[PDB]
Amino acid sequence: MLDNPFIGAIGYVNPDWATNVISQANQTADPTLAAQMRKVATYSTAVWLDRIAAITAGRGLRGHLDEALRQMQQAGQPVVITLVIYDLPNRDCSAAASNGELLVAQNGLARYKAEFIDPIVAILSDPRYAGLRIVTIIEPDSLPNLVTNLSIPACAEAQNAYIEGIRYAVNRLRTIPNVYIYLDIAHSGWLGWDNNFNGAVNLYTQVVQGMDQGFNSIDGFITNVANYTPLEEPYLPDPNLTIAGQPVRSASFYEWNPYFDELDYALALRNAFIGRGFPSTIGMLIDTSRNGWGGCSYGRCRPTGPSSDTSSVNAYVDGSRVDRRYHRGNWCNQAGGIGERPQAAPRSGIDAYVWVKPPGESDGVSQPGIVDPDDPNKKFDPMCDPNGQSRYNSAYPTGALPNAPHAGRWFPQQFEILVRNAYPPIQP
Ligand SMILES: OC[C@H]1O[C@@H](O[C@H]2[C@H](O)[C@@H](O)[C@H](O[C@H]3[C@H](O)[C@@H](O)[C@H](O[C@H]4[C@H](O)[C@@H](O)[C@@H](O)O[C@@H]4CO)O[C@@H]3CO)O[C@@H]2CO)[C@H](O)[C@@H](O)[C@@H]1O
Ligand SMILES: OC[C@H]1O[C@@H](O[C@H]2[C@H](O)[C@@H](O)[C@H](O[C@H]3[C@H](O)[C@@H](O)[C@H](O)O[C@@H]3CO)O[C@@H]2CO)[C@H](O)[C@@H](O)[C@@H]1O
Numbered sequence: 001m002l003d004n005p006f007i008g009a010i011g012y013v014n015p016d017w018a019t020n021v022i023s024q025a026n027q028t029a030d031p032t033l034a035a036q037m038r039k040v041a042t043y044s045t046a047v048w049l050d051r052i053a054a055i056t057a058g059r060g061l062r063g064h065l066d067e068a069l070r071q072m073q074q075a076g077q078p079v080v081i082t083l084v085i086y087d088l089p090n091r092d093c094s095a096a097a098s099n100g101e102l103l104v105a106q107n108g109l110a111r112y113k114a115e116f117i118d119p120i121v122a123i124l125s126d127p128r129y130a131g132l133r134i135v136t137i138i139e140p141d142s143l144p145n146l147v148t149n150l151s152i153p154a155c156a157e158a159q160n161a162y163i164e165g166i167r168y169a170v171n172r173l174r175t176i177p178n179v180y181i182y183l184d185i186a187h188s189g190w191l192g193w194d195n196n197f198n199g200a201v202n203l204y205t206q207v208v209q210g211m212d213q214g215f216n217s218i219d220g221f222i223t224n225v226a227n228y229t230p231l232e233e234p235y236l237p238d239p240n241l242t243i244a245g246q247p248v249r250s251a252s253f254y255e256w257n258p259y260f261d262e263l264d265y266a267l268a269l270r271n272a273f274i275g276r277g278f279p280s281t282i283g284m285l286i287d288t289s290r291n292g293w294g295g296c297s298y299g300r301c302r303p304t305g306p307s308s309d310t311s312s313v314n315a316y317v318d319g320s321r322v323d324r325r326y327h328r329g330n331w332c333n334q335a336g337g338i339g340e341r342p343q344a345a346p347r348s349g350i351d352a353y354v355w356v357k358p359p360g361e362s363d364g365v366s367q368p369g370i371v372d373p374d375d376p377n378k379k380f381d382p383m384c385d386p387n388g389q390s391r392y393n394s395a396y397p398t399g400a401l402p403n404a405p406h407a408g409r410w411f412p413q414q415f416e417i418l419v420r421n422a423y424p425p426i427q428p
């Protein structure tokens with residue numbers, strides 16, 4: 001196996017996502033915005049396996065891999081295709097927008113193994129695909145929910161199903177020599193606090209050391225999947241910087257969390273895991289699909305330096321942060337911008353920036369009363385209410401954009417905002 005599957009390979013371009021991008025560009029009046037959309041359609045995004053039907057629907061998992069072979073032949077270079085394994089029972093257990101089809105109380109773990117992992121592994125095992133690099137992102141949100149959300153019965157009752165299902169997926173996937181495995185580990189605005197950070201290091205160390213290959217069972221971890229947290233807060237580089245007598249991490253936006261950005265968080269986690277016995281060959285991914293924070297939204301434009309207002313930590317931090325969400329827990333349908341393009345080894349210890357969440361796809365429907373045919377357990381979550389308050393701190397609005405369809409469906413109003421707000425800006 002390679003030390004980094006993203007080195008020396010070009011990213012798979014998902015034609016089914018690109019078709020949505022190009023179709024929206026063809027309906028966009030502004031010719032520069034439309035040309036920016038056409039350029040976005042050329043970048044590489046992950047393919048989500050978000051239900052049993054996704055294995056065969058449309059071109060299906062086999063179709064994407066065949067298309068990857070096609071792109072590899074056309075380019076004369078290896079292709080790296082990213083897959084998201086996303087169907088654990090009691091999925092999305094701390095929210096409502098992405099609850100899945102399998103339930104722990106309805107033989108969900110058994111169905112997960114037999115109807116989801118086993119057919120995926122059979123397909124990835126085909127020797128026709130040996131020349132691809134196949135990256136599997138394992139079950140976003142599941143393990144982070146075990147760190148912070150055990151007070152929710154849907155999470156606590158699922159915890160051993162998560163552990164066993166994830167070990168089962170990784171143990172089977174590790175029998176395939178061109179499959180590179182990354183565990184999801186949330187983002188700095190979720191697990192950055194000392195207690196969450198240490199709980200996560202403990203949890204993931206136990207999960208991996210119980211795998212068949214122990215610490216050799218995975219190739220690393222990914223942060224920021226489907227979230228918006230910046231790679232870097234360049235104007236808040238020191239969480240202990242004293243402003244008006246207080247460290248800036250004490251600001252309301254951070255609540256003493258010393259990790260303001262994903263580079264600090266990902267590299268600190270990598271070092272922590274190496275200290276627990278993981279080999280130094282592990283690498284980190286960061287999802288940069290929607291964390292650029294160009295443009296303007298939520299009453300601010302991107303800061304161009306540290307704030308001139310040093311009269312209080314809150315004023316200073318709020319004027320200096322590029323993450324301009326009202327509250328750091330606002331995960332649904334945010335008016336952010338596309339971030340750095342997918343790219344290999346941008347920083348030591350970082351295997352790649354990737355677009356795992358595909359820009360333009362919804363995080364959740366924005367009002368109740370609407371049922372989706374293809375995901376009958378997807379429901380309205382108040383975090384997606386454009387007129388509501390955050391359910392993590394009701395003093396703040398959700399920031400969610402209106403007119404959003406159910407999670408995963410094309411959200412043209414947000415896609416236009418994400419392209420306009422891209423950082424670095426899209427060049428036609
Ligand atoms: O297979 C052809 C089929 O595709 C359908 O669209 C898929 C789309 O291909 C896929 O990327 C997407 O995956 C979603 C997932 O459903 C959704 O639950 C997840 O939501 C996130 C969300 O963004 C978070 O904020 C929060 O809600 O938690 C989850 C987990 O992070 O996001 C991914 C990526 O968007 O699902 C689509 C719907 O199945 C077409 O709709 C269909 O017509 C095609 O036949
Ligand atoms: O990242 C996308 C996923 O987000 C999930 O929500 C989590 C938020 O992303 C995260 O910011 C929030 O963090 C909490 C933290 O867990 C808690 O200890 C602290 O006190 O407050 C933070 C928020 O201020 O946690 C939530 C989960 O509870 C969504 O549930 C998921 O659908 C989405 O993909």
Ligand SMILES: [Ca+2]
Pocket residue numbers: 002003004219281282283
């Ligand atoms: Ca490696």
Ligand SMILES: [Ca+2]
Pocket residue numbers: 232233236237260261263264
């Ligand atoms: Ca930093």
